[PDB]
Ligand binder design. Structure first.
Ligand code: PTY
Ligand code: PTY
Ligand code: NAG
Ligand code: NAG
Lengths: 539, 541
């Protein structure tokens, strides 16, 4: 009678108790830093527990800071909707423009055709396409985008009798082949998210927190440098994840395995069937001018990102040196040009052209605002802004001093083991809650800790920021896992066991690359830079 | 043939040509102010003609200001999503919380019980309530407050067969019917008009009162809370009554029995008794206010009170008590929004904790509102629209638009005092149609003060009419936040709103030009004369 009470109403218990239980933090101290600490604990517990929706929890600073002495109500609101957040929202809008006209389907099917259609070749192609797409699209959107293709080819194969999707007789148990495919798509989404600033919200969160805390940093996490740093590691552990998934499910390096015979009979007599369904499902027709325009706009946007401030030459944002331009001009420019440009050019038949029949009305633009209004996760505005505002309040109130001086006991550890334990803590934390919440909670703490110790702040922030996105064990860990578990009726035990591979691979790959090749990207990780010394002296 | 080309593809033609045709204003002048003037002209043309979606057009400043060198990109984005914008979005969310539970249905049924279920009487009652309420609260707050109530009233009238909410019909939202336009534009216009009643009615009044007081100390005439109300309320009542009459004439064909709109209203007038029996039956079959509705109503009342009791000028207000950091009205609004998620819907969970029987809740108890509902119903483009207004105002200040527009106003000194008053009112009305009211007040009020000092007339005689005129904007959704909120809630095309706003504009201009010269003399006897302190100020100048 009481157990099910805690089963059903534990979230309300957390909401009602946590502020009261954390009240002694304010009541037993004097400075505003302890009020900010009370707020930080309450918000962090709400984020990890998800007692309140993350978007709703993120609006707490707007109430708390003005009531306390932290900042005025105007500054707190302006902390929301920063420049980088506008860039991310515009990136989401452009990704929706790409999803409109089904450019993603065309690209995915074309690449799957280019790669072989053998079951292992199919799996490799699916992972590669999903990773490349998730580099520019939200992970959940990319997962729900790629799942239909593998689903359809699976019903085709099962109808042909080659293999069975679910075990013969609770929802049906998925077989190892379909588990491999779906888990591969989900893990590919998660891994490909880490390779770009706009790939996932977590990257933007920790990049923005680092840029806000350290404005004087010589090392900058702009779009091209971050992509340079992160792409090789992404490729390495994506390939290794694919290899592990093949070995665990499809019996790689096990010619005598039962699963190996499954793949073998899928190779003979099913390659033709699944190829045929690939071209049939590629009935999108010839490349329309609409898709071509969307592709050109997207490529132009990326090129503008790379040309903002290169060291090799000047480029824009240095020709226009009157003010800072900062990567929001290209994105919003592309978003607006999506609405300006038409999608037919059939109206040109009026001006001395034969063509065909004239249009009956106004030609549609590349995208409709109804589509944007209904497929943008607008709560990310509040979530990212709340992270930024909490970081700024922690800086201003005095949380930095308290936490840094409290956690100075880690100075005795060597840098390598400190990096290892930071990565392990980040992975363990993000295994149970949303990645953005974990980044918001830990990144300011890591910055202040690395200031207290004599450690370059990036050396701990960047590997941990990447590690916050490596969630593979539970459906609650990240939206793609929940989507896949819903699609394929994946039992939590199977996913938890299969996540051992990607977790270890990502941990080792990060721990090796951030020490070897991260030095190649930024040559100053090992030392303590001058600006870090100035910041430490100030705080 | 080629005529059909213009008929079908004129929007894209405007999009492609207007930047090119307006480029000369940039080219022939060598100033960042003229660059900003080009940007403003292009955005205004796109707004009036609706070549692009309004929300998309509001995105242009992010691209334009950094490129044009007016202001940095990080600053430009932060001018979006200001404190006031958070207040607006929170107000919309609280309105959605009211709409989630059928509280708006209850309010509409009670109001219809009170009034008598006649479209004219109901419209007049809602207009009066909105006016009196916006006398004390921010205009956008009252508009968002009243929108669900108006929706419920229209739904009830539709159910009784009195009218249709929307025209019968691919992606564009349904076109509102005449009566829907009448009611929604009515509450928007009523908010705008009632905001001019009191000092705390809207931020524009506080702004220009502060400007006058700071510029002119040692002044015999003051605009404190009682005197300003005594001066403004009669003229405001005249605005509201005449605007109501015009809205009735234009939409339901008042004084026009031949019009088809009159016939349907006359048909709806029939059978009032059976209508009221049906209405109070529909009120009765609704159960008593559930704890969901009671809690959301208590939260809404608390939010309204906190709005009113912050720096009212009559007494202390909680803002001055918590003066360590500047707290504004987004605090109570976001607090209410958060509490709408924290508080439960029912309380059966503790009911079975008391061993008082009853069915134990089988699952988590829902909160007062679900984020899925908010993500779907909030018009999120309002963020870009209202932020675009704010950022465009700030860019006008920084670039040099403010100084340039003021320099043009100096030339009006040659006109005679009555003609000068009319011209100033017209200029204020025209300017406020493209910018936030506070911005236009900041643009024109100091110039008016200096010009009045130079021409030796009482500064209030010009400041009050123009200070009030800065708030009457009824032609475009960008002109004032209430219009944008109404257009978002009920999809009102800019053509209909622009053609409907002719009435209120002319009405307000005429009644101001009359009531200043007549009634202000009753309020301020020294209004026509040039007081001694004004003489010493001019001598100092
Ligand atoms: C020097 C400065 C000092 C400053 C001090 C500030 C202190 C206050 C800080 C904020 C506190 C907020 C408290 C109000 C919100 C309480 C929410 C309780 C939710 C609730 O009833 O949950 C249920 C269990 O409740 C339970 O087991 C407990 C019973 C709860 C009964 C209602 C309690 C709240 C009454 C109103 C309080 C108003 C406070 C206003 C400030 C299960 O809910 P679920 O999990 O099924 O669903 C949850 C989603 N709906
Ligand atoms: C220091 C000084 C700096 C100065 C800077 C100045 C910048 C000026 C920029 C001007 C150009 C950008 C804005 C216009 C973009 C193109 C708009 C095309 C509109 C269009 O084609 O409309 C159709 C008719 O076009 C026509 O009849 C027009 C002729 C055909 C136009 C074709 C346009 C696409 C190809 C060229 C693109 C060039 C892009 C350059 C950035 C009818 O469309 P509809 O109304 O049926 O449907 C509309 C659905 N939205
Ligand atoms: C920024 O860092 C440089 C060295 O990297 C230092 O010379 C300069 O004083 C710093 N500026 C501030 C404002 O701390
Ligand atoms: C303003 O100050 C001057 C200074 O002598 C004084 O003569 C004048 O009477 C004052 N104005 C009023 C309205 O008292």
């Amino acid at each position: 009678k009481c157990s099910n009470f805690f089963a059903n109403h534990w979230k309300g218990l957390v909401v009602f108790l946590v502020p009261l239980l954390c009240l002694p933090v304010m009541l037993l101290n004097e400075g505003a830093e302890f009020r900010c600490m009370y707020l930080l604990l309450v918000m962090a517990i709400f984020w990890v527990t998800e007692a309140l929706p993350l978007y709703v929890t993120s609006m707490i600073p707007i109430v708390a800071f003005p009531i306390m002495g932290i900042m005025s109500s105007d500054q707190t609101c302006r902390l929301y909707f920063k420049d980088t957040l506008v860039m991310f929202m515009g990136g989401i809008m452009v990704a929706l423009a790409v999803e409109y006209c089904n450019l993603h389907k065309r690209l995915a099917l074309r690449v799957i055709q280019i790669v072989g259609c053998s079951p292992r070749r199919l799996h490799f192609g699916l992972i590669m396409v999903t990773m490349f797409l998730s580099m520019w699209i939200s992970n959940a959107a990319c997962t729900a985008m790629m799942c239909p293709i593998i689903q359809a080819v699976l019903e085709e194969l099962q109808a042909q009798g080659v293999c069975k999707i679910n075990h013969e007789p609770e929802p049906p148990y998925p077989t190892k082949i379909t588990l491999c495919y779906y888990l591969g798509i989900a893990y590919a989404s998660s891994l490909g998210g880490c390779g770009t600033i706009i790939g996932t919200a977590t990257n933007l969160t920790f990049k923005g927190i680092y840029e806000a805390r350290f404005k004087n940093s010589t090392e900058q996490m702009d779009f091209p440098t971050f992509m340079f740093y992160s792409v090789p590691s992404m490729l390495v552990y994506t390939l290794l994840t694919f290899v592990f998934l093949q070995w665990h499910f499809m019996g790689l390096w096990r010619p005598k395995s039962k699963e190996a015979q499954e793949v073998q009979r899928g190779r003979e007599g099913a390659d033709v069937a699944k190829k045929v369904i690939d071209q049939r499902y590629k009935d999108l027709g010839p490349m329309s001018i609409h898709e071509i325009q969307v592709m050109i706009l997207f490529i132009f946007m990326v090129v503008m990102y790379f040309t903002r401030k290169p060291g090799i030459f000047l480029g824009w944002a240095d020709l226009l040196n009157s003010k800072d331009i900062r990567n929001s001009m290209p994105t919003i420019f592309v978003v607006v040009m999506c609405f300006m440009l038409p999608a037919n050019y059939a109206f040109l038949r009026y001006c001395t052209r034969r063509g065909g029949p004239v249009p009956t009305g106004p030609t549609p633009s590349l995208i409709t605002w109804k589509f944007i209004q209904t497929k943008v996760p607008w709560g990310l505005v509040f979530l990212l802004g709340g992270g930024f505002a909490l970081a700024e309040g922690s800086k201003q109130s005095g949380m930095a001093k308290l936490i840094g001086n409290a956690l100075i006991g880690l100075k005795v550890l060597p840098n390598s083991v400190l990096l290892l334990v930071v990565i392990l803590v980040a992975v363990f934390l993000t295994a149970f809650s949303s990645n953005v919440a974990i980044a918001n909670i830990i990144i300011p703490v890591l910055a202040e800790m690395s200031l207290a110790i004599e450690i370059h702040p990036l050396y701990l922030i960047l590997p941990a920021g990447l590690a916050c996105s490596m969630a593979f064990h539970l459906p609650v860990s990240t939206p793609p896992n929940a989507l896949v578990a819903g699609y394929a009726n994946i039992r939590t035990k199977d996913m938890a066991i299969a996540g051992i591979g990607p977790t270890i691979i990502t941990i080792i790959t990060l721990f090796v690359f951030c020490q070897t090749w991260g030095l190649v990207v930024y040559p100053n990780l090992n030392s303590f830079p001058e600006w870090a010394q100035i910041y430490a002296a100030a705080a």
